[PDB]
Scaffold this active site. Structure first.
Site, short mmCIF file in Angstrom:
data_model
loop_
_atom_site.label_atom_id
_atom_site.label_comp_id
_atom_site.label_asym_id
_atom_site.label_seq_id
_atom_site.Cartn_x
_atom_site.Cartn_y
_atom_site.Cartn_z
N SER A 285 -1.59 -9.83 1.36
CA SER A 285 -1.42 -8.72 0.40
C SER A 285 0.08 -8.35 0.26
O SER A 285 0.93 -9.04 0.84
CB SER A 285 -2.27 -7.51 0.84
OG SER A 285 -3.61 -7.64 0.39
N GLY A 286 0.42 -7.31 -0.52
CA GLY A 286 1.82 -6.88 -0.63
C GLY A 286 2.18 -5.56 -1.30
O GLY A 286 2.53 -5.53 -2.48
N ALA A 287 2.12 -4.48 -0.51
CA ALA A 287 2.81 -3.21 -0.78
C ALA A 287 4.24 -3.21 -0.21
O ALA A 287 5.16 -2.67 -0.84
CB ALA A 287 2.01 -2.04 -0.20
N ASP B 50 5.96 -6.96 13.33
CA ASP B 50 5.66 -5.77 12.50
C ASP B 50 6.11 -4.48 13.16
O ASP B 50 5.31 -3.57 13.46
CB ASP B 50 4.19 -5.75 12.01
CG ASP B 50 4.05 -6.32 10.61
OD1 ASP B 50 4.43 -7.50 10.37
OD2 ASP B 50 3.59 -5.56 9.73
C1 LIG Z 1 9.94 -11.49 8.62
C2 LIG Z 1 9.02 -10.46 8.87
C3 LIG Z 1 7.73 -10.54 8.39
C4 LIG Z 1 7.33 -11.65 7.63
C5 LIG Z 1 6.07 -12.06 6.98
C6 LIG Z 1 4.76 -11.29 6.93
C7 LIG Z 1 4.03 -11.27 8.28
C8 LIG Z 1 3.58 -12.65 8.70
C9 LIG Z 1 4.24 -13.31 9.72
C10 LIG Z 1 3.83 -14.58 10.09
N1 LIG Z 1 2.82 -15.19 9.49
C11 LIG Z 1 2.17 -14.59 8.50
C12 LIG Z 1 2.53 -13.31 8.07
C13 LIG Z 1 6.32 -13.25 6.41
N2 LIG Z 1 7.62 -13.62 6.64
C14 LIG Z 1 8.27 -12.69 7.39
C15 LIG Z 1 9.58 -12.61 7.88
#
Ligand SMILES: c1ccc2c(CCc3ccncc3)c[nH]c2c1
Length: 351
Positions: A29-31, A165
């Site tokens: 998704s993407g907010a 995150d």
């Molecule tokens: C830095 C921080 C967050 C992200 C993301 C989104 C989170 C993610 C990380 C790994 N695999 C799938 C989804 C993609 N690339 C990024 C680079």
């Protein structure tokens, strides 16, 4: 120097990326930002590419983008998310408006593991060891994650774990309201704003996670802030006079004193059948007074992790300059700072 870029529309958004990234496929998704999975032909790695939504829209967004990039460029640890690449299709600062971030593609989070698999004590040992190993690193740079929960912990088929995150934005009040996993792992001082929080908030979160790995069940699944506080105080006991004095909020302190006093429970009768060393460690993490909780470095030396503990392979971070946080700048000043960080990025080495 500069790679060749190609354009591609995927789900109503234009991805412009270097040729090295192929087979772009939308994910999640993407907010915060749109995310694609891809194959990196230079490294041979499957990667997740995030394109940031509206990075320099306000001062607050521009500073947040700078914060995210600063933080991600710093993290160089096995158990923490690293940056593989950062790029923009802009050839100058004047046309700079899109930032793309690349890291290793993750399949499963810890939420998927505890939900779908039976975990032995050895699995819990290894999983919690790795969280603490990454936290020792993070905390040594004076970085507080602030939002550790199973959905922010990526785990592979060999049980190898990474912290993702980071607490970069403030959550809204609405996403912290009700019967929600976004609050169940929060330390009560941060949940109820008792005092100035510190890095020990993350140790509370690790205890909640550890408990859930051992039982398969959420430790404090409160239906709201107050229901969750009651669940917490039932287990760990109501505060004594010493902790009450440290609660700077007068109303929060007043409310606490309205509650009937309760002793700390016997953790061996809550965590029935658990390794006594796991129970001992939980008692050291799930301490209401944040000054008395075990730190990540202390916890790595606890006997529960005797199979994995290696003090010569539990590194600390390089110093992290966080002085930008207290600085007030214009949008174009944060943007220019962000641009310098994109262009100065050096990818990590081969092994
Ligand atoms: C830095 C921080 C967050 C992200 C993301 C989104 C989170 C993610 C990380 C790994 N695999 C799938 C989804 C993609 N690339 C990024 C680079």
């Amino acid at each position: 120097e500069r790679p060749t870029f190609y354009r591609q529309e995927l789900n109503k958004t234009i991805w412009e990326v270097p040729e090295r990234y192929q087979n772009l496929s939308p994910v999640g998704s993407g907010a915060y930002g749109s995310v694609c999975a891809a194959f990196d032909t230079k490294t041979g790695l499957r990667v997740a590419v995030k394109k940031l939504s509206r990075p320099f829209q306000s001062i607050i967004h521009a500073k947040r983008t700078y914060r995210e990039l600063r933080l991600l460029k710093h993290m160089k640890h096995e158990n923490v998310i690293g940056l593989l690449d950062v790029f923009t299709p802009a050839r100058s600062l004047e046309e700079f408006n899109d930032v793309y971030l690349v890291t290793h593609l993750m399949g499963a989070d810890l939420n998927n593991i505890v939900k779908c698999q039976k975990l032995t004590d050895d699995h819990v040992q290894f999983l919690i060891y790795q969280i603490l190993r990454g936290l020792k690193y993070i905390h040594s740079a004076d970085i507080i994650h602030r939002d550790l929960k199973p959905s922010n912990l990526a785990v592979n088929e060999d049980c190898e774990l990474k912290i993702l995150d980071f607490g970069l934005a403030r959550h809204t009040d609405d996403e912290m309201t009700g019967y929600v996993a976004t609050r169940w792992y929060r330390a009560p001082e941060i949940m109820l704003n008792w005092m100035h929080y510190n890095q020990t908030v993350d140790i509370w979160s690790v205890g909640c996670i550890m408990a859930e790995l051992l039982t398969g069940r959420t430790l404090f699944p409160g239906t709201d802030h107050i229901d969750q506080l009651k669940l917490i105080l039932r287990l760990v006991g109501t505060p004594g006079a010493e902790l009450l004095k440290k609660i700077s909020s007068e109303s929060a302190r007043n409310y606490i004193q309205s509650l009937t006093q309760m002793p700390k429970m016997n953790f061996a009768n809550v965590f029935i059948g658990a390794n006594p060393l796991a129970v001992d460690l939980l008692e050291k993490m799930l301490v209401l007074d944040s000054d008395k909780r075990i730190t990540a470095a202390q916890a790595l030396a606890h006997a529960y992790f005797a199979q994995y503990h290696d003090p010569d392979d539990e590194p600390v971070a390089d110093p992290y300059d966080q002085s930008f946080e207290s600085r007030d700048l214009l949008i174009d000043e944060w943007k220019s700072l962000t641009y310098d960080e994109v262009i100065s990025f050096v990818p990590p080495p081969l092994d």
